[PDB]
Amino acid sequence: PECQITGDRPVIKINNTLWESNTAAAFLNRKSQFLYTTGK
């Protein structure tokens, strides 16, 4: 139970560095920055 937070992919290898997949996903979920200035 303690092993998994969410998802099913333990790691992602990025540039010879092993990332916890959930950590990478948590900074790759950024929308195009200009959308902060457009409004609703």
Binding site: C3, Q4, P10, T17, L18, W19, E20
Partner: protein, 242 residues
């Protein structure tokens, strides 16, 4: 089975922990230098536990020897503590499935979680001090405890003993930092935010390290290991994430 953790010297303490690691876990082939490895807990049947006998709290005398810890083997959780002088096992509420023969079992209303223990102890682990003195004081608090509801003093005692047994088994970093307190100059170990961060991310670390195959680094949340030396200096034993 039963194992002793001997706090007599820095060397006896480290040797005690390494004996336990060698018996209950298996080295990862890709994170192993010489005799030092990250090891994975061997799979045992659900409910399996081992006992830890606390010894050597007083360096020069054979005393304070009635404290035993009951540790669930597959995850190194502390299920409770045994007073061997009264033959009484004080068991946290969340370990009903741990059955210890020969002892009187007191099912406590208190659960084992750090959130609960820190509330009852009125003590935060970040900044918590541990010295030889406070382990003696912790021992005496646990030997004086009775009833089925944890007190402030017993909770502080459990927080300290869990740190220097189960968490040190998991994390070589905590082992190395705390063992300074056992020397003749008797300094104080102060648990750091980084120490706390390790203990709260053991599962995440356990899910990542079995995938390591010689990469230049490992990243788990805020934790970074930039070479094998960094991993070995920090993590000793991980869960078995099959």
């Amino acid at each position: 089975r039963e194992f002793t953790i001997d706090f007599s010297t820095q060397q006896s303490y480290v040797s005690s922990l390494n004996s336990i690691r060698t018996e209950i876990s298996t080295p990862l082939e890709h994170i192993s230098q010489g005799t030092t490895s990250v090891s994975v807990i061997n799979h045992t049947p659900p409910g399996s536990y081992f006992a830890v006998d606390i010894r050597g709290l007083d360096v020069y005398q054979a005393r304070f020897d009635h404290l035993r810890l009951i540790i669930e083997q597959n995850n190194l959780y502390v299920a409770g503590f045994v007073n061997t002088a009264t033959n009484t096992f004080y068991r946290f509420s969340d370990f009903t499935h741990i059955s210890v023969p020969g002892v009187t079992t007191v099912s406590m209303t208190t659960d084992s979680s750090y959130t609960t223990l820190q509330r009852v102890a009125a003590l935060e682990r970040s900044g918590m001090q541990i010295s030889r003195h406070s382990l003696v004081s912790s021992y005496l608090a646990l030997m004086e405890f009775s009833g089925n509801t944890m007190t402030r003093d017993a909770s502080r005692a459990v927080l300290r003993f869990v740190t220097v047994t189960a968490e040190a088994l998991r994390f070589r970093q905590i082992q190395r930092e705390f063992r300074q307190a056992l020397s003749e100059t008797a300094p104080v170990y102060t648990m750091t935010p980084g120490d706390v961060d390790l203990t709260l991310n053991w599962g995440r670390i356990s899910n990542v390290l079995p995938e390591y195959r010689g990469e230049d680094g490992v990243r788990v949340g805020r934790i970074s290991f930039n070479n094998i030396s960094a991993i070995l200096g920090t993590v000793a034993v991980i869960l078995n994430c099959h």
